[PDB]
Ligand binder design. Structure first.
Ligand SMILES: CN(CCOc1ccc(C[C@H](Nc2ccccc2C(=O)c2ccccc2)C(=O)O)cc1)c1ccccn1
Lengths: 10, 268
């Protein structure tokens, strides 16, 4: 549930 | 080629950050065609400019609290969330960054973003205030300092850093490489593979040194002066976290946005 991972994978 | 790397970083910098230092300086010096920003210097001028501060939530910014300091707190963390997103987009354009282990990419962002934020705040500051809402408004240093404790203690060390940092007279081409150097710090806690990170920062540092010699041939040892600012930013972060903890221990309804909570959780 990492929001930073979501921004990095976009 | 170090000049090609510098130009690539600058191009990504222009794409990722809507309000550059060049655009900010044109606003701060009034040498621009658009109208002057709304100036917030006291309670009345804040109430008149409050709805022009970018803030998208359940209720308008003016309804966040009866206290002026808390409304400033809420509006600032809305900006911070978007600032982290801009810095993340720029970080992904740094050659080699997205090839690193994803967990190391997270770590470099977790520890780097606020150091980048405070670096780029200086671009939006003069000795008397800071531009807000993409240059649409201007909030004075005296007003931010007049807020009740601990709210009045947040911005003042950032202004103090900015006065000294702006004396270096860097431009956007310099800053693009400098912030990339900061993101690619091999000594961040919990990094899995330090070597490939240091390999990238080595090239970034060489590109930075060449950039400063070409763009500032009169500023001898500008490279050495700038490197010392990288450690100042870590002190600012340490002081900032302590103020946020005073908020968490002594204030009630206040809660950081989810993205900010993730960054600060288990930080150092
Ligand atoms: C000052 N300014 C420009 C953006 O300045 C930044 C100054 C600092 C930051 C970093 C960010 N800060 C906060 C996060 C949550 C709540 C408050 C703060 C403050 O730092 C703060 C506290 C009290 C008073 C003023 C600020 C962080 O830690 O993530 C991000 C942006 C504002 C202010 C209000 C609304 C919009 N534009």
């Amino acid at each position: 549930p990492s929001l930073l991972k979501k921004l990095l994978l976009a | 080629d170090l000049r090609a790397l510098a130009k690539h970083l600058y191009d990504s910098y222009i794409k990722s950050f809507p309000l550059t230092k060049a655009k900010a300086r044109a606003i701060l010096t009034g040498k621009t065609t658009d109208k002057s920003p709304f100036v917030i210097y006291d309670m009345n001028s804040l109430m008149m400019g409050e709805d022009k501060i970018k803030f998208k939530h359940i209720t308008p910014l003016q309804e966040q609290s009866k206290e002026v300091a808390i409304r400033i707190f809420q509006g600032c963390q809305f900006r911070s969330v978007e600032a982290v997103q801009e810095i993340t987009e720029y970080a992904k354009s740094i050659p080699g960054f997205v090839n690193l282990d994803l967990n190391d990419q997270v770590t470099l962002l977790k520890y780097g973003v606020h150091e980048i934020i405070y670096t780029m705040l200086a671009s939006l500051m003069n000795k008397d205030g800071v531009l807000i809402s993409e240059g649409q408004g201007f909030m004075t240093r005296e007003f931010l300092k007049s807020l009740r404790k601990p709210f009045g203690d947040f911005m003042e060390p950032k202004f103090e850093f900015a006065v000294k940092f702006n004396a270096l007279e860097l431009d956007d081409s310099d800053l693009a490489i400098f912030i990339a150097v900061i993101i690619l710090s091999g000594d961040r806690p919990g990094l899995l593979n330090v070597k490939p990170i240091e390999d990238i920062q080595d090239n970034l540092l060489q590109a930075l040194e060449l950039q400063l010699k070409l763009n500032h041939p009169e500023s001898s040892q500008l490279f050495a002066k700038l490197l010392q600012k990288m450690t100042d930013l870590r002190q600012i972060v340490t002081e900032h976290v302590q103020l946020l903890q005073v908020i968490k221990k002594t204030e009630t309804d206040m809660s950081l946005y989810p993205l900010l909570q993730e960054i600060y959780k288990d930080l150092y």
